[PDB]
């Protein structure tokens, strides 16, 4: 009522690994953009 | 039309003019776009020219 | 499937797989999925 942290843990390494998930959605990886309605906006098919 | 080491640079803003409408016709020898597609000109919007 | 015709001098490099122009955009195309040749000649001693 004043020890958890075994419990804590793995619940703070899922959400962790979650948002890192998330948060690569928003990367180029060598690109004009991290959109597809912008490189299907100002680029040709091809 | 100037010389290639003192170039003129005309800034284009406020208004909505077809491009292709232009690049519609002839006249030309070369027509290459870097970054974007000369036929997807028309659904864009920009800030400056 | 031979497709034989002429043009203008310029717009040779309009018979491509995967391209925008006046002629390739109005009067002939050819899919980004080509497979085969394109071969081309002057004419106007004929």
């Not at chain 1, 843990?9 to 060598?30: E, H, I």
């Not at chain 2, 208004?15 to 970054?35: E, P, Q, R």
């Not at chain 3, 497709?3 to 390739?24: C, L, M, N, W, Y």
């Not at chain 3, 109005?26 to 071969?39: A, E, M, Q, R, S």
């Amino acid at each position: 009522s004043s020890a958890l942290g075994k419990l804590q843990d793995v619940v703070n390494q899922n959400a962790q690994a979650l948002n890192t998930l998330v948060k690569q959605l928003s990367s180029n990886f060598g690109a004009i953009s991290s959109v597809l309605n912008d490189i299907l906006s100002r680029l040709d098919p091809p | 039309f100037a010389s290639v080491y003192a170039w003129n640079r005309k800034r284009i803003s406020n208004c909505v003019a077809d491009y292709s409408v232009l690049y519609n016709s002839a006249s030309f020898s070369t027509f290459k776009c870097y970054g974007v597609s000369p036929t997807k000109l028309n659904d864009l919007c920009f800030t400056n020219v | 499937y031979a497709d034989s015709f002429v043009i203008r001098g310029d717009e040779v490099r309009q018979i491509a797989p995967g391209q925008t122009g006046k002629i390739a955009d109005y009067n002939y195309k050819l899919p980004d999925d080509f497979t085969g040749c394109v071969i081309a000649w002057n004419s106007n001693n004929l």
